[PDB]
Design a protein around this ligand. Structure first.
Ligand SMILES: NC(=O)[C@H]1CCCN(C(=O)Cc2ccccc2OC(F)F)C1
Ligand SMILES: [Zn+2]
Length: 139
């Protein structure tokens, strides 16, 4: 679990969105596993606007942060679940690192700010849903 709070927005994994998130929906994309809902309180997370391929992510199954090299946002296969069927998830970035069910929502950050959130994993890999292209999160 975990979310990004920037301005009047809350960014979460679409498969983990709540009734409140859906009732205050701004945008959602099943192919990216992202949902953005509106908030009354002002968020202060800074979003990165860069092409960094190195950063640090929070791994809740170890209560630790890990440094990672990650790939550029791309289309990548993801097995079924209480939430989705086999499909290509777009805007996904992979890294060699630990992740297990329960780790979704952990933030990935570089020197410029928030890069994305944990969305997939398995086999010694971790996948992050990129948010750097969502320029509207700032305005
Ligand atoms: N379709 C999706 O984006 C995910 C929906 C929930 C299920 N998905 C996973 O990958 C679950 C998973 C399995 C083994 C290790 C780590 C895992 O993820 C965690 F890091 F994000 C896929
Ligand atoms: Zn950066």
């Amino acid at each position: 679990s975990g979310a990004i709070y920037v301005g009047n927005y809350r960014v979460v994994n679409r498969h983990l969105a709540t009734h409140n998130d859906w009732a205050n929906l701004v945008w959602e994309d099943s192919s990216r596993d992202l949902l953005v809902s509106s908030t009354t309180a002002q968020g202060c997370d800074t979003i990165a606007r860069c092409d960094c391929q190195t950063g640090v992510y929070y791994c809740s199954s170890r209560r630790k942060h890990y440094p990672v090299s990650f790939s550029k946002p791309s289309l990548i296969f993801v097995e079924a679940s209480e939430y989705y069927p086999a499909r290509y998830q777009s805007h996904l970035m992979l890294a060699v690192g630990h992740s297990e069910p329960g780790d979704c929502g952990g933030i990935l950050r570089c020197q410029h700010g928030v890069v994305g959130i944990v969305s997939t994993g398995g086999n010694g890999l971790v996948g992050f849903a990129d948010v750097r292209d969502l320029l509207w999160l700032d305005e």
